[PDB]
Amino acid sequence: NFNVAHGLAWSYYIGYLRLILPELQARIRTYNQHYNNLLRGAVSQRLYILLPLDCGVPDNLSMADPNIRFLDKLPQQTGDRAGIKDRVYSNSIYELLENGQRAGTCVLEYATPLQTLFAMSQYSQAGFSREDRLEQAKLFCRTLEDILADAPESQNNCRLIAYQEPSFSLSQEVLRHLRQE
Amino acid sequence: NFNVAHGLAWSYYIGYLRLILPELQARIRTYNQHYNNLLRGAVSQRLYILLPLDCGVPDNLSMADPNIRFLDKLPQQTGDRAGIKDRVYSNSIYELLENGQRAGTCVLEYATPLQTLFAMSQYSQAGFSREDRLEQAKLFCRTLEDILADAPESQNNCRLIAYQEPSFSLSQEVLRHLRQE
Numbered sequence: 636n637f638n639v640a641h642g643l644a645w646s647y648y649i650g651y652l653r654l655i656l657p658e659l660q661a662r663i664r665t666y667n668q669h670y671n672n673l674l675r676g677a678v679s680q681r682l683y684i685l686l687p688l689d690c691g692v693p694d695n696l697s698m699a700d701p702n703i704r705f706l707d708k709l710p711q712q713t714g715d716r717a718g719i720k721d722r723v724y725s726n727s728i729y730e731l732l733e734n735g736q737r738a739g740t741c742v743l744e745y746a747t748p749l750q751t752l753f754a755m756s757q758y759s760q761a762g763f764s765r766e767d768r769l770e771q772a773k774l775f776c777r778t779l780e781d782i783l784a785d786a787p788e789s790q791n792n793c794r795l796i797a798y799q800e801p802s803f804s805l806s807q808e809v810l811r812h813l814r815q816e
Numbered sequence: 817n818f819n820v821a822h823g824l825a826w827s828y829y830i831g832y833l834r835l836i837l838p839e840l841q842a843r844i845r846t847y848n849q850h851y852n853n854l855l856r857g858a859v860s861q862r863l864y865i866l867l868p869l870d871c872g873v874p875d876n877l878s879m880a881d882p883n884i885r886f887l888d889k890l891p892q893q894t895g896d897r898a899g900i901k902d903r904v905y906s907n908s909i910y911e912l913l914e915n916g917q918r919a920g921t922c923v924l925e926y927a928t929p930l931q932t933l934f935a936m937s938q939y940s941q942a943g944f945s946r947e948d949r950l951e952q953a954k955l956f957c958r959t960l961e962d963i964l965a966d967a968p969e970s971q972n973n974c975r976l977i978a979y980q981e982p983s984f985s986l987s988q989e990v991l992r993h994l995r996q997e
């Protein structure tokens with residue numbers, strides 16, 4: 636069942652990343668210059684993409700870690716897509732707390748196809764076991780990294796954060812990637 | 817390569833159809849009662865989903881047929897999704913012209929995963945030929961129909977329109993499905 640995660644990764648590139656990454660720096664600059672609080676640190680460049688290998692993808696990031704707190708939305712990106720006039724692509728900005736204080740600010744989200752792998756393992760008609768789910772999650776991330784390595788749209792625009800939970804700190808995991816830049 | 821279209825279909829259900837179909841009747845009623853022109857026909861119930869087996873999915877439906885013309889958007893559906901606060905699900909309403917006159921009004925769009933199958937066949941690193949694309953497109957539609965047949969979310973909410981181009985009239989193809997209701 637190689638083909639499942641392979642297709643989901645290509646889908647994620649074709650239907651999302653290649654569309655939004657080219658416009659993301661401009662959107663962040665606009666946020667930083669026009670909407671961001673005058674007294675706060677700039678939003679980091681780059682979309683940070685969370686890849687939990689157990690495909691546990693909560694809708695609310697504050698569920699996964701208290702130290703990750705919603706700050707604001709970027710300006711919306713819209714475009715006609717497959718018969719939908721002005722389909723909306725939206726991204727959320729988070730503050731990352733270290734010792735009750737802001738250590739970082741970045742555009743952050745989960746790779747939503749990992750939600751599909753999770754659900755497919757829960758639905759009997761999908762014919763996809765829980766054991767194949769880790770293997771698929773890993774294959775998804777490899778394929779995605781292979782794609783972005785060749786992608787002209789990835790111009791230091793994008794950072795993948797793969798992780799496994801065995802207390803694990805997600806905010807620390809993100810701060811580690813954020814400080815490397 | 818059974819697994820490609822299989823996963824894309826499940827993804828389409830999990831990440832879209834199961835989320836929007838339950839709320840679609842309410843959204844259409846709201847449009848019909850509050851936003852729709854007093855003197856026009858009601859928008860049909862049901863989301864009409866175009867499935868061109870050649871995976872030719874233009875962004876603008878007026879490209880595919882002059883007689884299909886954008887009228888309006890439904891009210892937006894929003895929800896927190898995978899770390900994105902207020903991700904937007906948007907649908908477009910079209911008028912369908914027969915002899916220069918309005919014969920029908922419906923919420924209409926293409927199945928966007930067919931765009932992924934198309935693009936995957938164009939990108940060398942995807943390892944997916946044009947010949948496998950028809951087979952995958954067919955498998956996508958079968959899997960989707962299998963899912964919706966068991967789906968509690970599909971409550972006469974949803975109509976699949978599969979077709980192949982050999983002049984073919986898309987608006988007629990849609991009017992045929994629309995008049996069956």
Ligand SMILES: Nc1nc2c(ncn2[C@@H]2O[C@@H]3COP(=O)(O)O[C@H]4C[C@H](Oc5ccncn5)C[C@@H]4COP(=O)(O)O[C@@H]2[C@@H]3O)c(=O)[nH]1
Pocket residue numbers: 646647648649650651652717719722723724725747748750751824827828829830831832900903904905906925926928929932
């Ligand atoms: N028409 C229509 N189809 C939709 C819509 N939303 C999802 N779908 C389709 O549902 C399936 C599963 O969705 P996922 O969210 O798990 O995966 C997505 C995640 C990412 O997209 C975004 C977009 C905005 N913000 C975050 N991520 C790329 C990937 C593929 O996205 P698509 O190529 O658009 O197709 C998908 C896919 O086939 C919609 O609003 N309209």
